[PDB]
Amino acid sequence: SVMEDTLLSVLFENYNPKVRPSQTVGDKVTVRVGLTLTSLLILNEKNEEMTTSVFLNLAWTDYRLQWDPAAYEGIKDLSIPSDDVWQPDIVLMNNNDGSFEITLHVNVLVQHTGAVSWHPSAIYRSSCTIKVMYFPFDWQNCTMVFKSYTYDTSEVILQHALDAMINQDAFTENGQWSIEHKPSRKNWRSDDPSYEDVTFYLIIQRKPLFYIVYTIVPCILISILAILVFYLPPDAGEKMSLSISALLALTVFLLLLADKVPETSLSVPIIISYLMFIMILVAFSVILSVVVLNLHHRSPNTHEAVEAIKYIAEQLESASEFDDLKKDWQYVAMVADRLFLYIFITMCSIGTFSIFLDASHNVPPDNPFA
Amino acid sequence: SEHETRLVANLLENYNKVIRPVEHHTHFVDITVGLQLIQLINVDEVNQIVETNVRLRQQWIDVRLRWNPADYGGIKKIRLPSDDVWLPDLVLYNNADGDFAIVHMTKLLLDYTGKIMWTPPAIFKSYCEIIVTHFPFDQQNCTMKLGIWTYDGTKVSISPESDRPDLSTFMESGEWVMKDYRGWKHWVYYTCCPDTPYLDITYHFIMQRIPLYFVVNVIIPCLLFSFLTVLVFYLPTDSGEKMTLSISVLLSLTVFLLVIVELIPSTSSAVPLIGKYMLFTMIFVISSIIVTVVVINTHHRSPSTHSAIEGVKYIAEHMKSDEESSNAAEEWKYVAMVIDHILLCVFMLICIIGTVSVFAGRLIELSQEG
Amino acid sequence: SEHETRLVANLLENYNKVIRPVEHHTHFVDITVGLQLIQLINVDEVNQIVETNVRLRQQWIDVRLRWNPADYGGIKKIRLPSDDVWLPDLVLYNNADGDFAIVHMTKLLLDYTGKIMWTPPAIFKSYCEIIVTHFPFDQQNCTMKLGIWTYDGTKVSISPESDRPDLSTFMESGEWVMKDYRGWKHWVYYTCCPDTPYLDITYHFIMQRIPLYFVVNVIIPCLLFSFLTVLVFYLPTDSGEKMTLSISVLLSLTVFLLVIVELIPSTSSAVPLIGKYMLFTMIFVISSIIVTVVVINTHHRSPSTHSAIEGVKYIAEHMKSDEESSNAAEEWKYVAMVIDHILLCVFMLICIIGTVSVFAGRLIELSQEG
Amino acid sequence: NEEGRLIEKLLGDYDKRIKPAKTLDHVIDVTLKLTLTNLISLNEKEEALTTNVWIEIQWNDYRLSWNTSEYEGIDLVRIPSELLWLPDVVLENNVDGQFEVAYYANVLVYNDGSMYWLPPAIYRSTCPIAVTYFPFDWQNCSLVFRSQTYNAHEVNLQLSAEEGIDPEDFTENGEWTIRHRPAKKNYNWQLTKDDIDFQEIIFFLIIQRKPLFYIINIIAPCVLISSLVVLVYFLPAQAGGQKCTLSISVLLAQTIFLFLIAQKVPETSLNVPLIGKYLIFVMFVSLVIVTNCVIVLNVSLRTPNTHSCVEACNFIAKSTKEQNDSGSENENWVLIGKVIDKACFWIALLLFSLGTLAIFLTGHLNQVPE
Amino acid sequence: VNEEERLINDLLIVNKYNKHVRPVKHNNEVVNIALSLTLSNLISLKETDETLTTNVWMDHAWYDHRLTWNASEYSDISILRLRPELIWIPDIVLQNNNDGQYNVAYFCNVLVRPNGYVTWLPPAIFRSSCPINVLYFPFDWQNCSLKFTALNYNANEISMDLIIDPEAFTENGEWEIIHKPAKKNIYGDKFPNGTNYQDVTFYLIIRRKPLFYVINFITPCVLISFLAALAFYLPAESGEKMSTAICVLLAQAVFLLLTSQRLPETALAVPLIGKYLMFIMSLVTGVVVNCGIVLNFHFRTPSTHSGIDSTNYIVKQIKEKNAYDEEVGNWNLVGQTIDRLSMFIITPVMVLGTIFIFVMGNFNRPPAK
To answer: Where would one find coiled-coil regions in this protein (chain D) (predicted)?
Structure first.
């Protein structure tokens, strides 16, 4: 009773819905912003698009809602729909690639002397620079800048919790990636009067090892038929034609591979590294098989009286066997041996190279997890 | 205090939001547009659709918003939310594919005098020419008109604000590149009606396309195929033993050319390139076609290639000799003298066609690169 | 005039729309519903989705709408805005995949008495069985039940009105054809609860599907592939000298149909059918494989066809006689006789299992055709 | 000039949902018209389209002719949507999607009570293009639209030219073309048996398409293909013995290519419309290509196999010569190529005929509808 | 009329009743709220990303003490309707599966009992991120956990107490629903200094995998394998089909490669385990290897891959001489090795082929354990 109807009344009589919990132009209302992440569902590492979900915990004080006996001293804590406070119509300078879901228009926790607690989980369409640099083992970092899209920091100050909180705090276990750390730094670019956005850093690490495995098999298994086509010459010289069949076959195979590679990066591309040199490794088996094909080509051919008849017989046979013996002199196997071992150098050299680069790529550019 | 409540309430009462600050029958409501694309998110030259960042600077005056010491004296310039304002139905003429995004419920600023600005952070859906003339090396100028939508120059007039580039905030992630962009004003009166119609801002986007990755993959299997067909020439004249062997290649390669066709027309369908680009491939690819068919039909062009005891000896020797003849006949079929002709016949052809393909390639690259 | 203001004012005060014209503890609200289907713009047999239009002919009564010379007298039948009506949350039980569209904001039929109807040109997306047994020749009857959503019998009741076909306005551009369409009513009380539950209209769509496009191309490559198989068998007789050639065409054949089955899975899962069907193709074609298995295995089935001066004349003709009986050996295996049994053996067996394929295929359509 | 009082006067009596109908037996005079401006999506196989229509709306309601303070002030007024009778437009046969931006827009009230309004609308529709619209003779797109609310005994729509156009702003990036746009104003009475006519708006659009790009992709390959097979056909006379199988390699290659085509463009017609006539020539000119093609191997399949002590021994050896000669003789009577050579000219003129039959007829199906 | 006008004026739902005020008899323990979960349908499953679109009947109950009516409300009709804005509605949040706001399970018509007890239960088209993990593929196919409850209120403003999942499991799913337990609870946490919001915890333990991919996929293996199997039987019956035998490698090779290509395609659409994916590609490689083996083994060997008297002696010389050549080749033939090859092909096929379904079983036995 104690002026309850009165209080109650006066409050709703004088209280202003559309007003800011501050008095004039000054230090403003110090709103607390801090989100406990739920998990993330889709990383479009290719366009640098980020759809995650977290809690929008906001909290500041409404010294305009401090109650009295019944709602203050009666029930120190009571729930009341928002819709009555300035809400950070927050957009993300890079990210905020789309609207809020479970972000605004939801109830809030209002304390006795005016404290306000609003904890809503939400899904948000963002876009961070995971750029086409989300695959190097050295990976990269990003700028996630949150802030309102009609308000300018003049009638409120924004403030954070931790900066180490981490993003693996609610990292998706469903992620083909991994994370090292999440930096959180408060910002106010001076290119705009409006103090604004906060930059949040993603020192992301995404190592999904699954198909590069059977990709290796081609390179090496194709090599099987490759070393084979380079081995088949002094193995079965008649490989002559069958050889060409091999490369038709070998080339179509690698071209189909050419088919799956562009359409697969089509959703998760970054530096060429792997492709850069396998591209070379490609060109390598490609041309090596084709010049060996020219190795194959280079051969212009390969690619008394009684006794007289006898004598005429003696000369017939012998005469042309030298001729076909000439073909021997012409297609001997010197090259095959020499370049099948130049094949030895080439393929085992260029092989242990990307082997190496790849080797160097996973270990060397790994520690910049920062 | 200072007429506190009397101040605020009076203002609400006699003021109709929907009213347009019409001032006598003349100048119309003078309202100016000023678009600053902060940045672009994505574009589809094929479907000529773009999602872009726009901060619309909208200006106009409402002499009804002028004040005295009890509104301007309170705090010079202040923040009043939109609603109460008459929002020009802005519209991109041949564009407009989408609603202005974040135009709604934003705020504006009123001066001690009245002058108001409405500059809400937009990003929207666009629709501009690309025609099959945008992907050219010689580009096309995206004609984009902007201006008042349902009001005439007698009720209202949209005017421009300034010059500024489109590559000022052009997307570096675009598969295209900018030349220049200009925008000049205009008033459109129609021979239809004797009346004076709306005003408009006309954008002109002059940019040339094609990211270079494409460039390399395609022309190299061509010089690739060039060498196999090059081999298609040299293989036969230096070795007609694997004519059919090459039969294989002819199959494996035009099919390679066939499947490359699925890939690049979808590219074609993925990105609108001026068809006159297509003829490059047309004759080029098709000569691979006319040349083969002749080269290999010719490759193919050849009939079959692609005392008494003493007398016994002479009836027998005579048998060996006319078959001797016969052998020479079929060889008199596959000569190695003109396969050399076709070699230089066409290689000059290829160095002609090729250098002719390089011709227009080089030529308008003498125009584009400029 | 005629109690002008007194008549419309009184009507608004003591009139309510939230309420339903409940009349004592009995038959519920007499709801008359029906389908008036005149267009089926889009449907997918695969996902069993149907976006059609049916004017929702509703018919029921509310005495409160009865009038005298001051509303009936005004103009017999008057049409009132639907708002005043309690609109049922009708919905497709195992369907309802989409909102009804165009029902809101419409006209309502009122009578001097009270009779009322409102046939809304409702268009919506539906969801009913088609399963893999949707498009056979023997059809399936999509069970479509419709009735009040969240209201039980104790408050509202609906009932059929008339029988009308589904083909009355069935799509002549449909990839299907109708046979019959029946709709009877019922009330569903459940063993769960002792209560008397909602009423509903159950439609059953009986119609056979499948254009003949997929059909023409399944069988063409079959007969054509049976031509090469037929060649498969005949060649060893007319050209066994190309058994290897045969091999090539089996790599050919095999890849082609292995690729044919690729199409199937895409198309089949892209357009629904009862698996029992592909079973036909399965063994029939594994039959060409099972048979080429044996036939070419059998085709390759064979070991390798897959004085003293007087003295040497004798060592010599000896040389010749040894080899001659020897060449007789390889021909001893390629007897050119079993080759004719294999094509006839299988020609009959393919003419028979083909006629077998032909059998259930036609039997099933001597069932469908019906 | 009573400016305030007048506004306040009518608003007193101002009636919303009531039509400006003098009385009830002669309806109001409603004017409408549409200027096409965007034909956004042509999915002819499903008979649907999306267009930005200028919905020119006009009617009369002197319920607000004004005095010196509003009519005379300015013979022009722009008053909000929700403030006068509004035609809820839709295309009977087409509009399958509620209008977008086609309503809720500023209307126009001159001074005598003339009302003008014109919102732009992107919406979906379903015009003809039913197993026809892909010819050279075109199916006239017939769209009739009217208010879907009331029926012509109270409402009456008007129109204008029924002779003059759809190509007024027919899109230049359409894979088609328009040649005439007729439009009639009419009453309501359809096949379905509806009475009380509500007039509508008929939209004829007989348009052309088929600007083939795929034509020569189809035309040069087939010639290359025909030649390839004619290679198969004449190349044998030129080709060596190792060519029978040579020819085969081509069949394999020839149809690998073939059904791949069969898979390529069939896709084409499913994503876009369809028609069988042009379809018939291809597959059957194609099946004949295949036919004489396999016929060829069956042709290069046909033929039986081409697919004193001194003297006693001199006697017998002179026999192996004549003996084997009888054998090589075999070859003779077997491979005297009457059938093959003639098979070249067989397909040749047959080629000319298949071609003439087809392109001559394509000449016709472009020349009758020309 | 029995005080009806007056009484609903007494309740005035919106005006007299505090709809923005939840009748929890003021600050105390809580309003006894109860949630009931019944899945009406499961339309889509995404095993790979642990996401599910499913329909639920959001059966809700709580007593509205200000809702109790009198004669012309209560007894006039011991049951009546009242919209959401005129009925207190729990703010049920799908705790770990509402990362996709609830549809038409929102502000819907509710059921008004006579003595305040109210009943609101409409349909919920929802999306969830259930505990798939890369362990939702072994045969147990995990247990999908979900919690439902009134999000906003705590343990002194709300108490929610507590149906099979296969009750409305979708029959067009590529999986199988084995069980679905239901038990409510309430729980505070470390950072919170007080207990609150009670919830409906419903675990769904399911299983899935086709008996169809097995069909057309192993099918080609025994068919293909017989080719490679015959491959070694064929080197005997006629190894002379050198080039043509070579053709088949190209051909059995191109077949092999894109077969594996279709594999990841469906793979990405499905998070496949490492245990199974290897047996597939391991064994096709087994043939791939032996195709390469086929290569060499098929082309592996170096070669197999007195005057008148004077004259004819010349021939007997040329005779014998190239007879040495002729034979230098059969030296290479290596034919008494033939059977052992195809015997030691049989043995291994048996070894590995068995090793797989041997392993098939050694893991087929323990789950059935």
So the answer is: none
Assess contact for B227 and A223: CB atoms under 8 A. Answer: no
Burial grade of B167 (CB within 10 A; 0-12, 13-18, 19 or more):
middle
Longest dimension (CA), chain A: 154
Domains in chain B, CATH or no CATH each: 10-209 (2.70.170.10), 213-301+336-368 (1.20.58.390)
Positive or negative torsion for Cα C278, C279, C282, C284: negative
Domain ranges, ordered by start, for chain D? 3-209, 215-367
Contact (Cβ atoms closer than 8 angstroms) between residue B122 and residue B55:
yes
CA–CA dist A207, E348 (Å, integer): 36
Our CA-based measurement puts residue B73 at a distance from the nearest CA of chain D, in whole angstroms, of 31
Tell me how close the Cα of D91 comes to any Cα of chain C, in angstroms.
Answer: 12
What CATH code is assigned to D3-209? 2.70.170.10
d(CA D177, CA D167): 8
Nearest to D249 among C121, C248, C310 (CB): C248
Selected for mutation to probe chain E from A11, A41, A80 (highest E CB count within 10 Å) is: A41
Domains annotated for chain A, with CATH where assigned, are 4-205 (2.70.170.10), 212-366 (1.20.58.390)
Q: Is D342 helix (H, G, I), strand (E, B) or coil?
A: helix
Whether the Cβ atoms of residue A214 and residue E260 lie closer than 8 Å to each other: yes
Cβ atoms within 10 Å, residue E194: 10
**Nearest residue on chain C to D245, alpha-carbon basis:** C245
How many CB atoms sit inside 10 A of residue D301's CB? 20
E-chain CB neighbours of C243 within 8 Å are 241
E279 in helix, strand or coil? helix
| CATH, domain D215-367, list 3.40.50.150, 1.20.58.390, 3.40.1010.20, 3.20.20.80 | 1.20.58.390
Contacts of A225 in chain E (CB under 8 A): 249, 253, 292, 295
Residues in chain D within 8 Å Cβ distance of C228: 294
CB contact under 8 A, D314 and B312: yes
Contact criterion met (CB below 8 Å) for C134 and C207: no
Q: Exposed, middle or buried by CB within 10 Å (0-12, 13-18, 19+), for A166?
A: middle
Q: Does D76 touch chain B (CB under 8 A)?
A: yes
User: Cα(B108)–Cα(B88) distance, rounded to whole angstroms?
Assistant: 14
C8 CB within 8 Å of a chain D CB: no
Cα(A217)–Cα(A211) distance, integer angstroms: 10
End-to-end CA distance of chain A: 61
List Cα–Cα distances, A63 to A22, B275, C104, in angstroms.
9, 69, 45
> Chain B residues with CB inside 8 Å of A100's CB?
none
Domains defined along chain E, listed by start = 4-208 (2.70.170.10), 213-300+335-364 (1.20.58.390)
- B175-208 burial, b for 16+ CB within 10 Å, e for fewer? ebebeebebeeeeeeeeeeeeebbbbbbbbbebb
CA distances in angstroms from E19 to A68, A348, E22, listed in the order given = 21, 79, 7
Separation of alpha carbons D365 and D355, rounded Å: 15
What count of Cα atoms within 13 Å lies in the side-chain half-sphere of residue E51?
Answer: 14
Contact partners, residue E300, CB within 8 Å, separation at least 6: A235, A236
Cross-chain residue pair A303–B241, CB shorter than 8 Å: yes
Reduced to 3 DSSP states, what percent helix, strand and coil does chain C have, rounded to the nearest 5?
A: 45, 20, 35
Half-sphere exposure for A334 (CA within 13 Å, toward CB):
7
How much helix, strand and coil, in percent to the nearest 5, is found in chain D?
Answer: 40, 20, 40
User: What subunits make at least 3 CB pairs under 8 angstroms with B?
Assistant: A, D
Chain B residue at shortest CA distance from D234: B297
